[PDB]
Paper text:
Two plasmid-encoded dihydrofolate reductase (DHFR) isoforms, DfrA1 and DfrA5, that give rise to high levels of resistance in Gram-negative bacteria were structurally and biochemically characterized to reveal the mechanism of TMP resistance and to support phylogenic groupings for drug development against antibiotic resistant pathogens. TMP is a selective inhibitor of bacterial dihydrofolate reductase (DHFR), which catalyzes the NADPH-dependent reduction of dihydrofolate (DHF) to tetrahydrofolate (THF), a necessary step for the recycling of reduced folate cofactors. Trimethoprim resistance in Enterobacteriaceae occurs almost exclusively through the acquisition of plasmid-associated dfr genes that encode intrinsically insensitive DHFR enzymes. Expectedly, all three enzymes form the stereotypical DHFR fold with an eight-stranded β-sheet, four α-helices (B, C, E, and F) and three catalytic loops (the Met20, F-G, and G-H loops).
Like TMP, the PLA binding mode is dictated through hydrogen bonding with Asp27EcDHFR or Glu28DfrA1/DfrA5, and the propargyl linker forms π–π interactions with Phe31. However, unlike TMP, the bicyclic moiety forms van der Waals contacts with helix C (residues 43–50). In both DfrA1 and DfrA5, the 2′-chloro group makes van der Waals contacts with surrounding residues Ile21, Thr47, Ser50, Met51, and the nicotinamide ring of NADPH. This orients the biphenyl ring system such that it lays adjacent to helix C, picking up hydrophobic contacts with Met51 and Leu54. The binding pocket of the TMP-resistant enzymes is not capable of accommodating UCP1228 in the flipped conformer present in the UCP1223 structures while maintaining optimal interactions with the diaminopyrimidine pharmacophore. Critically, unlike TMP, the PLAs preferentially form the ternary complex with NADPH in their respective DfrA complexes. When superimposed, both structures of DfrA1 and DfrA5 complexed with UCP1223 and UCP1228 show a clear density for NADPH. In comparing the DfrA1:NADPH:UCP1223 or UCP1228 structures with TMP, the Met20 loop is found in a closed conformation rather than an occluded conformation. A comparable enhancement in cooperativity of 4-fold as seen with DfrA1:TMP was found when NADPH was titrated into DfrA1:UCP1228.
Numbering used by the authors:
A (entry chain B): 1 to 157
B (entry chain A): 1 to 65, 67 to 157
């Protein structure tokens, strides 16, 4: 099973401010929608609650509490180990989709990074982890918008 | 200025049937929307007539005849003139079809965005051979009503 990771990181490293993404870069959300269409997303419970079960995605959510959801496209796991064990029986690809805790847990395990660098320095208290030295960018594209952003794909090895 | 190219190719090589793309692969259009957002698109006149001036894109349309009063659409008399003028205002253009424009520009583009669509349709518009100096650098498969696979190639 392949693990991808997709995130939008502002220029000071902030990805979140409490429950919010502290910016709106019009058009960048299209990248996220396109890459996650009909994919399995691995998300922390906090991010899952902020995003909801958007249509045409499948969600593996990790929680330490009794969190539940009766949506048939949502599977809830009590650990990341259990999530990954179960996911590899049912899919060949999972996209790690946040938030800070889940990114920090799994950054050393993922194969492909989708990073949109957002041209803003917002307030916030959630940051992206350091990127292991063995990742290299293989694709870059710049976008002008209300907040500019640059989309880069990194490959491991 | 860098040139990209974006296309969806069916399993038997068809990209069009007259003025239409002969499939509807739910989800694949999201890739096209995402990569072209606020970009300059170079398109042939026939493709521009089939797609129209969709919001949040800028169009360089080539014709030997045809006009548009849309402020986001530029009409050029040649691909050469389109490229000469685009380099004055942007560092990136996306070649977005159709068959004639792909054939004329494939040897000049730096990055390919190719979605392979799992259907074998009828049609009469095709895509050129990928030049041998291109290498795939990213691939992802999608299951949908018609499956599709997305691949980015870089010129080396
Ligand atoms: N691209 C972006 O910019 C982007 C992408 C995603 C989200 N975000 C932001 O990131 C923030 C949320 O990130 P976050 O770090 O605070 O929380 P998070 O990673 O989304 O979720 C944290 C929660 O997941 C559960 N969890 C974490 N590790 C676990 C483990 N090993 N086993 C079992 N459960 C585990 C716990 O849920 P329980 O509390 O239920 O036990 C934890 O409280 C938001 O601001 C959000 O907007 C930004
Ligand atoms: N991803 C996909 O599957 C995809 C993407 C886009 C398009 N398509 C398909 O491709 C088909 C259209 O392709 P096509 O080859 O027939 O037409 P096209 O490439 O879209 O346009 C051809 C016309 O562009 C003008 N032109 C071509 N070369 C020129 C040059 N060097 N200088 C000035 N003008 C030039 C001419 O316009 P005038 O006749 O006005 O002189 C020509 O008739 C449609 O089926 C469309 O659906 C498929
Ligand atoms: C577009 C932001 C982004 N960009 C990149 N590059 N990577 C990422 N991981 C994310 C993200 C995220 C979290 C998961 C999220 C997403 C959403 C959400 C809701 C609706 C839409 C839509 N199009 O309607 C889009 C996104 C809401 C809250 C959160 Cl917390
Ligand atoms: C999505 C298909 C695709 N995929 C990839 N990978 N590459 C490509 N170049 C294309 C294409 C195309 C031509 C240019 C086109 C596009 C459209 C059109 C109109 C509206 C929307 C929308 N807003 O949903 C989307 C597409 C209509 C006719 C044509 Cl002839
Ligand atoms: Ca020409």
């Amino acid at each position: 099973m392949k693990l991808s990771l997709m995130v939008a990181i502002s220029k000071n490293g902030v990805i979140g401010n409490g429950p919010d993404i502290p910016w709106s870069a019009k058009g960048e959300q299209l990248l996220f929608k396109a890459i996650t269409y009909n994919q399995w997303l691995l998300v922390g419970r906090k991010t899952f609650e902020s995003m909801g079960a958007l249509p045409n995605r499948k969600y593996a959510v990790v929680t330490r509490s009794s969190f539940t959801s009766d949506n048939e496209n949502v599977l809830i796991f009590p650990s990341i180990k259990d999530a990954l064990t179960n996911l590899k029986k049912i899919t060949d690809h999972v996209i790690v989709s946040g938030g800070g805790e889940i990114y920090k847990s799994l950054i050393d395990q993922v194969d492909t990074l989708h990073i949109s660098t957002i041209d803003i320095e917002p307030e916030g208290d959630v940051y992206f982890p350091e990127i292991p030295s063995n990742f290299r960018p293989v694709f870059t594209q710049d976008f002008a918008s209300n907040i500019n952003y640059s989309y880069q794909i990194w490959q491991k090895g």
